[PDB]
């Protein structure tokens, strides 16, 4: 049961580089590709993410795509860059220009056939294929446009598999680019139709995690990408190690999504705490659950206290009792009963895995489906409608060929998504 990864744009390639560092460390693969591990548990599921090349070697199931090769040359120059198969690198000759329409219609259609040829070459090699995993930002240009193009083609070609995306979205507090609202709105329009499950992270939340919890004096993008690589490698942990209560991406989707449009989730990871402070508080299942539900540990600007939990899932790694897990989930559901949607008798799924990440005694990853996400879409919509009424910078997109009707359609579809979340929020049973 093997996953294929796709990394698109600068953010995607950087997050991918840190992810493949974390996974290669976890399975004991040398940066030359030679297996040097020290337990059979590392070897026995290596197939899930690596293909085996001849006399020792392992190759990582990933496709790298970008519109200007500067980043790709940077990734090839990195410490693990040599591991990647050369034929898997796809790049063009001119940039996206921060324009969704260029990335989707002009340079997208120019490159897209070579990416589908490579993904099919990678997919047809699997003995049984599980879902794809894609990392990209929604505020950029080639990431948003070509990522959603590729997602649509893969959904046409593989409708029975899983399509999973992790996505970084522009913060209202601090933009790096002026035209972010257009790219975000069009990308959310593509995702709500195409995706099966999508996780959203705010860079502002990663900065607040680093400063308040880790107390880093001078954080860098490497730290943010380390938090992301930690969660990405955590969601898949039950795929590749034994445990007392196995779980799977499809089983998570079936338990988390009540209706097919409601597939946007908040993410958190609980035992983040510096090793020096860790001496002041011992690890235990109650301790993990309390940090796990603390809004300090959630990776989105919206706060749960303004919404209600529809569903939640917990994946535990480590040697622990099932009784303690079950009774903790009962006590949290009973004591905080106003924040849980009442027509479901138990909103939390649990899962337990035997093998923790190296150097931690225990860890949990949290996925939450909460109506307070309506906030991210509403904030973007105000900024978009502000821009669209004045036809702001619009000539760039229309000159590529877009009809103005696409913008009003995408706005209407996002507004209906906000309305569907808002109706279920209604705290009053009425």
């Amino acid at each position: 049961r093997e996953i294929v990864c796709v990394q698109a744009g600068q953010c995607g390639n950087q997050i991918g580089s840190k992810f493949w560092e974390v996974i290669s460390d976890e399975h004991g693969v040398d940066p030359t590709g030679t297996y040097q591990g020290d337990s059979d548990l590392q070897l026995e599921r290596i197939n899930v993410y690596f293909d085996e090349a001849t006399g020792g070697r392992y190759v990582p199931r990933s496709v790298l795509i970008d519109l200007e090769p500067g980043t790709m040359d940077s990734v090839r120059a990195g410490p693990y860059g040599q591991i990647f198969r050369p034929d898997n690198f796809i790049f063009g000759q001119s940039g996206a220009g921060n324009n969704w329409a260029k990335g989707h219609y002009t340079e997208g259609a120019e490159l897209i056939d070579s990416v589908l040829d490579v993904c099919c070459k990678e997919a047809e090699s699997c003995d049984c294929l599980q879902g794809f995993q894609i990392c990209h930002s929604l505020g950029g240009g080639t990431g948003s446009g070509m990522g959603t193009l590729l997602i649509s083609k893969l959904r046409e070609q593989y409708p029975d598999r899983i399509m999973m995306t992790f996505s970084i979205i522009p913060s209202p507090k601090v933009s790096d680019t002026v035209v972010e609202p257009y790219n975000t709105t069009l990308s959310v329009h593509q995702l709500v139709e195409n995706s099966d499950e999508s996780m959203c992270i705010d860079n502002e939340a990663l900065y607040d995690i680093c400063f308040r919890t880790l107390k880093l004096t001078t954080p860098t993008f490497g730290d943010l990408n380390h938090l992301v690589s930690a969660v990405v490698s955590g969601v898949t942990c039950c795929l590749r190690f034994p445990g007392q209560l196995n779980s799977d991406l499809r089983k998570l989707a079936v338990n988390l999504v009540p209706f097919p449009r409601l597939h946007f989730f908040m993410m958190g990871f609980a035992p983040l705490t510096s090793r020096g402070s860790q001496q002041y508080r011992g690890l235990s299942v109650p301790e993990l659950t309390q940090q796990m539900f603390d809004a300090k540990n959630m990776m989105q600007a919206a706060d749960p206290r303004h919404g209600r939990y529809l569903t939640a899932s917990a994946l535990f790694r480590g040697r622990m009792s099932t009784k303690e897990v079950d009774e903790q989930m009962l006590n949290v559901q009973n004591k905080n009963s106003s924040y849980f949607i009442e027509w479901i008798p138990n909103n939390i799924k649990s899962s337990v895995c035997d093998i923790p990440p190296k150097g931690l005694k225990m860890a949990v990853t949290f996925i939450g489906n909460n109506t307070c996400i309506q906030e991210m879409f509403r904030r973007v919509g105000e900024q978009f409608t502000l821009m669209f009424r004045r036809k702001a910078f619009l000539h760039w997109y229309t000159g590529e060929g877009m009809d103005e009707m696409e913008f009003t359609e995408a706005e209407s579809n996002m507004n209906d998504l906000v309305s569907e979340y808002q109706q279920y929020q209604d705290a009053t049973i009425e």
């Binding site: 337990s39 548990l41 034994p242 035997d354």
Partner: protein
Amino acid sequence: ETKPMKPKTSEVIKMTVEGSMLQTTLTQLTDAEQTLNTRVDKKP
């Protein structure tokens, strides 16, 4: 082709939760505890 699964050793099985307490029954015993079970058929 699917490579056949390789059998585990003693310390590898001890890592998990089920196997550790299976091996506890199998190995970690005193001399007196192996005498506990006996047959009493046709005796009374």
